[PDB]
Amino acid sequence: NEEADYLGVRIQLRREQGAGATGFLEWWVIELQECRTDCNLLPMVIFSD
């Protein structure tokens, strides 16, 4: 189904501030929508010729 068989990605914004000012260490986190184990890992299965 091409695009319809692609996994949903849960996106988060992590914003370390350090409780003070506007110093914002900002980075994005991505998780798979259906993660159960190892939500910190996105297993991409690559078939190398």
One of 1, 33, 37, 40 touching its own copies (CB under 8 A): 40
Q: How many angstroms separate the CA atoms of 13 and 3, rounded? A: 25
Q: Contact between 29 and its own copies (CB under 8 A)?
A: yes
> What is the total residue count of the chain?
49
One of 1, 4, 25, 34 touching its own copies (CB under 8 A): 25
Is residue 27 classed exposed, middle or buried when 0-12, 13-18 and 19+ CB atoms within 10 A define those classes?
A: exposed
Binding site for its own copies (CB under 8 A): 3, 6, 9, 14, 16, 18, 20-23, 25-31, 38-49
